[PDB]
Symmetry: C2
Subunit: 91 residues, 2 copies
């Protein structure tokens, strides 16, 4: 539990912010990193990985990809679906 | 080579257009389908898969996911990167 959290949550910010977060983790010695996103940010999660694959040149490999759905519960109890992606990369 | 082409290329159209294309393939007896997209359409490819997994109910499973990059060559020879996703699903 003491090693730096290896998750990069990709949201609304410019893609290069998440690229910087992944590169910072690589420089801490964290060799396995998980990029997670939901909804429209799924494309930005893939961009983050692909940009990092170039900026780390070191080989970075995609280890695992999972897609799925999560439930969004509204203030009045209605429930709707959002897509998710999780991408594991490894140095 | 005579069976219906099992690829759904997801682009700029409303997501339900690609949902319908995948369901049409399922109705044709095609049990393995590949959803492909690039750039900002990557999010819509994932949504396509997740929406179909509900509308098929038949259990549709994600078989393989691959992400990568392709090169876009401009009219004057410059080259730039675009992200890709490919998602194989199976009934």
């Amino acid at each position: 539990g003491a090693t730096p959290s290896n998750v990069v949550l990709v949201g609304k910010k410019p893609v290069m912010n998440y690229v910087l977060a992944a590169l910072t983790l690589l420089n801490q010695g964290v060799s396995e990193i998980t990029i997670k996103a939901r909804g429209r940010a799924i494309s930005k999660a893939v961009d983050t990985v692909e940009i990092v694959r170039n900026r780390a040149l070191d080989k970075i490999e995609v280890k695992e990809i999972r897609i799925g759905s999560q439930v969004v519960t509204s203030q009045d109890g209605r429930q709707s679906r959002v897509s998710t992606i999780e991408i594991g990369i490894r140095k």
